[PDB]
Design a protein around this ligand. Structure first.
Ligand SMILES: O=c1ccn([C@@H]2O[C@H](COP(=O)(O)OP(=O)(O)O)[C@@H](O)[C@H]2O)c(=O)[nH]1
Ligand SMILES: OC[C@H]1O[C@@H](O)[C@H](O)[C@@H](O)[C@H]1O
Ligand SMILES: [Mn+2]
Length: 272
C-alpha cells in the first residue's frame, strides 16, 4: 500500500512541449529511458521515501582493484541515493584493504570475503531480507553527479557508452549459435553495459541466476562468450525487457568519449 503524496508546488508538465526532443525517452515496450530533463527528482524522492526504500549497491574489488574503493565509496557518499537508505556490499579477497570511509546517516557497509559476479549475487536470502533494490556496478568508477531513485524499477540495464549511436549489426553481441548468449544480426534493441544494472532484488536474482546457468552451459560446451557476463546480460535483457533503461549519462568515459552535447550530466564515470 502506497500513502498519498503531500502537496507539492512544481512546474506543470505540458503535453505539447516535450522535455527532450533530441533523444528517445521511452523504449518501444514503454519503459522510460532516463535522461536529465525527463524526471522531477522531488516527486520521485517523495514517492520512494514514502515507501522507506532501501537500495543495496554491490561492488567487487579483487586483487589490485581494492585500490579503486576509496574514491568509489567516497563519491557514492556524495552522489548515490543521498537521503535514502543504502547498504553497500563490497565483495573482496582482501577485507583488511577495504578503506575506512565515513558514511552519512542511514547508510551501511558490509564486507563479504570471497575466495563469479553473477554466481555470487544469485547471497540470495540475505539481499531479500535487507534491501528492496539492488544495483550492481564496476568498482573502477567514480560518481560525479546525481545517481538517485530515478533509476529504480523492477529491472534496468544501462546503454553502453560506445554503442548508443550504433546500428544493431555493429553491436558486439555473442554471434556464435553455439553460445547460450547468441543473438543474430537482425535482433537486438540496445547494447547494454555489464558495468551498471539492477532492479528489485527478485528481478536481479532472476537475471543473475539465468546468466549464471547460461554461462555454466557454455562452459560445459567449451565456449566462452565474447564479452563474458556482459554477453549473457544482453541476451537476458533482449528476451526479458528492462522496465527502465539508463542513458549513457550513467556510464561514461570522458577520457575516451569527451562530453558531447547530448549528455547534460556525466553522473558515473570511468577512472583513467
Ligand atoms: O582483477 C580484477 C578484475 C576485475 N574486477 C572487478 O570486475 C570489474 C570488471 O572489470 P574491468 O572493470 O576491468 O572490466 P572493464 O570495465 O575494463 O571492461 C571491475 O570493475 C572490478 O569490479 C576485480 O575486482 N579485480
Ligand atoms: O564491445 C564491448 C566492450 O566494450 C569495451 O569498450 C569495454 O571496455 C568492454 O568492457 C566491453 O564492454
Ligand atoms: Mn570497469
Amino acid at each position: 500500500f502506497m500513502v498519498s503524496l503531500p502537496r507539492m508546488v512544481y512546474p506543470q508538465p505540458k503535453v505539447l512541449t516535450p522535455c527532450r526532443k533530441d533523444v528517445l525517452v521511452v523504449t518501444p515496450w514503454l519503459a522510460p529511458i532516463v535522461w536529465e530533463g525527463t524526471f522531477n527528482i522531488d516527486i520521485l524522492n517523495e514517492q520512494f521515501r514514502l515507501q522507506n526504500t532501501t537500495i543495496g549497491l554491490t561492488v567487487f574489488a579483487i586483487k589490485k582493484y581494492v585500490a579503486f574503493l576509496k574514491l568509489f565509496l567516497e563519491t557514492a557518499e556524495k552522489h548515490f541515493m543521498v537521503g535514502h537508505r543504502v547498504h553497500y556490499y563490497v565483495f573482496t579477497d582482501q577485507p583488511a584493504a577495504v578503506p575506512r570511509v565515513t558514511l552519512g546517516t542511514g547508510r551501511q557497509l558490509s564486507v563479504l570475503e570471497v575466495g563469479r559476479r553473477m554466481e555470487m549475487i544469485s547471497c540470495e536470502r540475505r539481499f531479500l531480507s535487507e534491501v528492496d533494490y539492488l544495483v550492481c556496478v564496476d568498482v573502477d568508477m567514480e560518481f560525479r553527479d546525481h545517481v538517485g531513485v530515478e533509476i529504480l524499477t523492477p529491472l534496468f540495464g544501462t546503454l553502453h557508452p560506445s554503442f548508443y549511436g550504433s546500428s544493431r549489426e555493429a553491436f558486439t553481441y555473442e554471434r556464435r549459435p553455439q553460445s547460450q548468449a547468441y543473438i543474430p544480426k537482425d535482433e537486438g534493441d540496445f547494447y547494454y553495459m555489464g558495468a551498471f544494472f539492477g532492479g528489485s532484488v527478485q528481478e536481479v536474482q532472476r537475471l543473475t541466476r539465468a546468466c549464471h546457468q547460461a554461462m555454466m552451459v557454455d562452459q560445459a560446451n567449451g565456449i566462452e562468450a565474447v564479452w563474458h557476463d556482459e554477453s549473457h546480460l544482453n541476451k537476458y535483457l533482449l528476451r526479458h525487457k528492462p522496465t527502465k533503461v539508463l542513458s549513457p549519462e550513467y556510464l561514461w568515459d570522458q577520457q575516451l568519449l569527451g562530453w558531447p552535447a547530448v549528455l547534460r550530466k556525466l553522473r558515473f564515470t570511468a577512472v583513467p
